[PDB]
Design a protein around this ligand. Sequence first.
Ligand code: HEM
Length: 154
Amino acid sequence: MVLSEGEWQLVLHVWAKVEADVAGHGQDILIRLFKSHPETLEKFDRFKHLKTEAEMKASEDLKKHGVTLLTALGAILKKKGHHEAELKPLAQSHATKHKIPIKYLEFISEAIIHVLHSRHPGNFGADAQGAMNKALELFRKDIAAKYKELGYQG
Ligand code: HEM
């Protein structure tokens, strides 16, 4: 698939707001993911033991990882579809080391869209949400193709 420049502008316009607070957004997103789909928490051996949202909010480690996660995603969105190089090491570690099924990348895509919608209503109307969804679907499709080449397709 291919996004138009107008769709990329709607995606990078709301992403510029997310970047004003990367650690806060990283925390909200991971907590929304773990609450909504608790089975995903099991994949993080580092966080597995967190029982409540209050423990999640207070974990400095969790917040550090949320910044690592969003910084990598941001670098991929800013490529505007030319992300082949960025996608390689990410597809290799998530398929071979972490073992993250495509379904879980769909679940965190849902969490990203929920959080931007709650925090940035003015910059995340229907058209901006359709463009962000297209951008994350492109990301998932390309990662899924690489997972296949790597021998995982999960
Ligand atoms: C927007 C999607 C995602 C991005 C851009 C992302 C990015 C990253 C990055 C940059 C790292 C550190 C380097 C590496 O190991 O590759 C990482 C580590 C990891 N990711 Fe992801 N990730 C994504 C989705 C997920 C999802 C959905 C899960 C699990 C349900 C997951 C599980 C993990 C685990 C277990 C690690 C290692 C954490 C720790 O022990 O250090 N990732 N991810």
